[PDB]
Amino acid sequence: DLSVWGMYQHADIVVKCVMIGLILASVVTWAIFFSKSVEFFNQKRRLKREQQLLAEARSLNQANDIAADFGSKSLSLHLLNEAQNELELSEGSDDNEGIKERTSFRLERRVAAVGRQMGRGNGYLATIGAISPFVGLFGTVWGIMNSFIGIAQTQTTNLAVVAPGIAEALLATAIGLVAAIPAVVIYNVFARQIGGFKAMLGDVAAQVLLLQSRDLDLEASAAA
Amino acid sequence: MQTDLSVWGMYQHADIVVKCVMIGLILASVVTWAIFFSKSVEFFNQKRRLKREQQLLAEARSLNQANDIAADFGSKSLSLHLLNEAQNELELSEGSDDNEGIKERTSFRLERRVAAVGRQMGRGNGYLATIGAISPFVGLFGTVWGIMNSFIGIAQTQTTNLAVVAPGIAEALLATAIGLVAAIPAVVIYNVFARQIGGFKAMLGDVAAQVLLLQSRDLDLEASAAA
Amino acid sequence: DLSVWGMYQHADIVVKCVMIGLILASVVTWAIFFSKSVEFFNQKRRLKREQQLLAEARSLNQANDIAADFGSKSLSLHLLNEAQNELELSEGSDDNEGIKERTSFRLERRVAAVGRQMGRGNGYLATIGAISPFVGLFGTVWGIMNSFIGIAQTQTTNLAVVAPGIAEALLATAIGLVAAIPAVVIYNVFARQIGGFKAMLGDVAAQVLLLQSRDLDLEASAAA
Amino acid sequence: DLSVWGMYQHADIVVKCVMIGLILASVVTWAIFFSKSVEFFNQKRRLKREQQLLAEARSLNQANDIAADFGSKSLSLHLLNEAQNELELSEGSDDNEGIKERTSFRLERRVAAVGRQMGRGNGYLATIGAISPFVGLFGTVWGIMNSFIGIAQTQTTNLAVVAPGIAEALLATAIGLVAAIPAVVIYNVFARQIGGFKAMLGDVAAQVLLLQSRDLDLEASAAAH
Amino acid sequence: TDLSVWGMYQHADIVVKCVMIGLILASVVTWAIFFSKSVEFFNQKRRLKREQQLLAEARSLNQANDIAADFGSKSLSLHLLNEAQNELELSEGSDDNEGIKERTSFRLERRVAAVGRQMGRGNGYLATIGAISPFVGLFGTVWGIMNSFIGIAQTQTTNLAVVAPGIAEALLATAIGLVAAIPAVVIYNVFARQIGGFKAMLGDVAAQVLLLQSRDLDLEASAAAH
Amino acid sequence: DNGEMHDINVTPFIDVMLVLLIIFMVAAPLAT
Amino acid sequence: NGEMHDINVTPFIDVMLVLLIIFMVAAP
Amino acid sequence: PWPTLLSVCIHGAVVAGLLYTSV
Ligand SMILES: CCCCCCCCCCCCCCCCCC(=O)O[C@@H](COC(=O)CCCCCCCCCCCCCCC)COP(=O)(O)OCCN
Ligand SMILES: CCCCCCCCCCCCCCCCCC(=O)O[C@@H](COC(=O)CCCCCCCCCCCCCCC)COP(=O)(O)OCCN
């Protein structure tokens, strides 16, 4: 009768709902891990390839001629297009400091938007890492209340009658930590991956601002 | 005590210090759910509106186009409110020639409005953060009182039968249970609204940035056309 | 013969000093609450009312004429004087953007200084909140330890001999948490109300900067 | 049984070593408090005097004439010399905004460096205050574990037979609390006082930047006629 | 039956065994990281302190290059001076000194942040081991508790002395949890502070490069105007 | 910072130890 | 800013281990 | 002042309740 499976089968409906709720939270944290680890791998591998190619550029025109290789989903091509588009919208301006402030402001907004989009799942993972111990240990407290009420409903004088009820309860904390531990590991892995990726993307965006700013000053100096 | 017991009978025999603890936590959870239903409806309405306003402004290529497109928006629209904040900085600068002055003042005004709207949108969040942080320890205090009352029972009766320790462990369980039932929703709802505030302040910042880009570009083009 | 008072009467001299110390920490945290709560309410109510009046102004002259009656300890009058004083220290300057920089910097110092000065007394709330659990717990550990040190001499085999001393000990955790919870709630409440007050005072200081900035640029155009 | 020496001598090495470690953490937190509080109090007391004298000054030359009587370790005299030295190094410049931004940047760095130097002991205090409870918990978990081994080996027990074992565990907890409580109090007292000091030093640095910036503008105006 | 810490580990359930081994390996990693990072931080702190002290006499960016030319290739201050001199050689045609100053300031701030990121390598293990190793132990306790109550039920026993070995397993799984957790949390807080102090010292060196460049550009411009 | 979880939670250890205490408070009166 | 202000009840874990012993050993 | 007197009075009032209820 009594086993790690068998003690689920006859547990109270409240602790069955707690255990099933934590098993669903476990399945979701693993689904997020397999989904996002592939996304970070492809997004970081592409961004590394693109940055290592753009590193030889000396002008924004040369950077556009390099970046035309990249597919329409490319973050580097999307940052070059945001900078080039500010020239195309601004062609009547003889003020260059305006083009610099508008481009700088628009690229930092795009880098923040991509960084915020990469972080999609992390709010769930931090929630499951925070609550799962408490949700599981609430399952135990209700199981212990039922065990203790069971003594008052059927008066008894030996612990071997209630010991199954203690095991049936304590399993809800075991499943609580088994849900919590992956969620905290996976969350820390992605918090560190995102920090490195936002910085790598910011270093690409910084190269675009440097290329544009240097080209505007050299073009203005050619009026001498 | 230990005959035909129920969870409500367990509350009926509790000490008056542990009744006040768990009644206080029940009320704190009722206010938690009242904030969740109130704020989640407001975030849905505000975010659903602001997303529409941003999509309707995406084709704008001058501050005059943004102003006319936005004239159709309701008087409560944050996007129209930011455009009026920028338009008013022109109509209070009319005699000046210092376009850099106009740009820095408008940047400062819109930054202050975006901060103020975010600060107002967060109205209830400090209550939620308080319950999520403190209710575990309010529950713990009730457990300590129940455990203490179990030793008062042993001392007053001069014996260790389950019947004399039972009233204390009974109310210690309830104080733990209600402590968790207050804590868990408050932590979940606080993380949801912290995520919803981050997403909303960012989207409002993108609208305010579009207004600044439109104004800055339009002034520089007007100045070049004068030259 | 036990009760919450009788336990304090029949306690060790170290547990009495812990309990009296925690009750004095409770008296202090509630005295700070009633003192600061009235001060913050009055200053919030005044500053909001002054901001509603100054929202009508369209020049720094009109603003400091509107403020001229405000009490000698008014924060918006203090900010308007601090802007007017940078002008009267600068009367020889043809450089306007230097005045805009110097006033912007000086008002930032003062808005921060008011928020810092308003935060006086919070170090007690933070300290009482952090240590009261540990001071109550020390009372419990000591009370339990003194009881078992006794049984280790008497050799008595019955739990009812120590049980009074154990209850007298757990009571010092209960008093420890009663001193702790208000202090940690109230610390967070005032940390948040200082944040909101500093933000509102920043919105008032911004109006002074905008009025001064507008007037300097309009005056420069009128001279030209 | 009878005394704290009785618990200390008849304690498992693991628990004894935990108690020595917590006693040394208690010694170091008091050593930090007495060492740092006297020199910090003298910096705080001096800096407040320097600011009260400099608040009279209305040109950077007048501020040097006020400050020249200050001791060679005065932070205010350092900030005045640090600003004056930017004029010394820039004498061939006709650009003032360069002198302002270089001075602003150099004083910001100087103020931050003093901020790091003043806070230098805090890592011990914050660590000992947060961690000593868990080191105490390891000591009690270990002493309590040994008492369950005692029950499991003897298999005939009463609450007096285990009383030495739990008295040793409680003593390791008590020493943990006696390390933790002073460390949190001392850490919060310094966290407040350092914040007030960095703010006061920042307002002296702000006065030097304001005086220099205003003086350059009035000189640049006078040079036009 | 042996109740030494070894005999206790030898009697424990497979779930508790692999928890204890996992925590022990996490402590081996926590110290292997500590000795690896500390020897590197000590060498990089000692090196950068000497370089800053030796750059302090530089009157001009040319003197700073001539001083730094003797520094070995991995030198962070030589690397910062190369970033500053490279922004000049990339923009010789430019006449906007303010741009060069802005572009150089942006490059050096980015470089200092990148050295901070590179120096923070491996700290994610210390944070994770510090956060999870308590819980991982807790789980080892609760599994030991469950096995002991299942043992009470299966055997129908009523003397509580039979569970004393079982709860000693649970207490040991707690203890090894703290032994993994506490060093990892202390060492993470230590390296977080050492990196902040190092970023500040490297920032003070990067600031001297900007001050030298900015002053040389301004002095060159006034001499050319005269 | 980057938002890593990097510190002991304190409260999950209290609450599980609280139930470990309570299960032995109900069990020990039912032992020999 | 930088003050320690959070509740830390961790020594009550140690107290609960001691009550866990005294209830274990005081069985009837 | 008024804030310390109010605080010590309301805590005086609750401990007077412990004196009463313990008789
Ligand atoms: C031993 C534990 C139990 C007893 C001791 C602790 C009791 C709780 C202490 C609560 C002190 C509260 C002081 C009043 C502050 C009010 C300030 C304010 O205006 O609102 C705050 C918000 O409110 C709070 O922070 C209230 C927190 C209440 C905590 C209550 C916990 C349960 C206590 C149960 C025991 C008492 C039972 C009494 C009998 C039913 C701050 O503003 P906000 O932006 O953060 O939120 C605005 C939207 N509401
Ligand atoms: C089961 C648990 C067993 C105990 C485990 C204890 C912790 C083990 C890890 C110890 C690591 C020690 C690292 C020392 C680094 C020293 C760095 C330095 O040179 O000194 C700094 C000053 O020292 C530190 O910051 C040290 C921080 C405290 C570490 C020691 C206390 C740990 C807790 C109590 C241990 C005793 C009890 C355990 C007994 C077994 C100087 O300033 P900074 O900028 O480099 O650092 C920030 C402060 N300005």
Residue numbers in the entry:
A (entry chain A), C (entry chain C): 9 to 232
B (entry chain B): 6 to 232
D (entry chain D): 9 to 233
E (entry chain E): 8 to 233
F (entry chain Y): 11 to 42
G (entry chain Z): 12 to 39
H (entry chain F): 10 to 32
From the paper:
The Ton and Tol systems are sophisticated molecular machineries essential for virulence and survival of Gram-negative bacteria. Both systems rely on the proton gradient at the inner membrane to produce force and movement that are transmitted to target proteins associated with the outer membrane. Ton is involved in the uptake of essential nutrients such as siderophore-iron, vitamin B12 and carbohydrates, while Tol maintains outer membrane integrity and plays an active role in cell division. We have solved the high-resolution structures of the E. coli TonB-ExbB-ExbD and TolA-TolQ-TolR complexes, revealing the inner membrane embedded engine parts of the Ton and Tol systems, and showing how TonB and TolA interact with the ExbBD and TolQR subcomplexes.
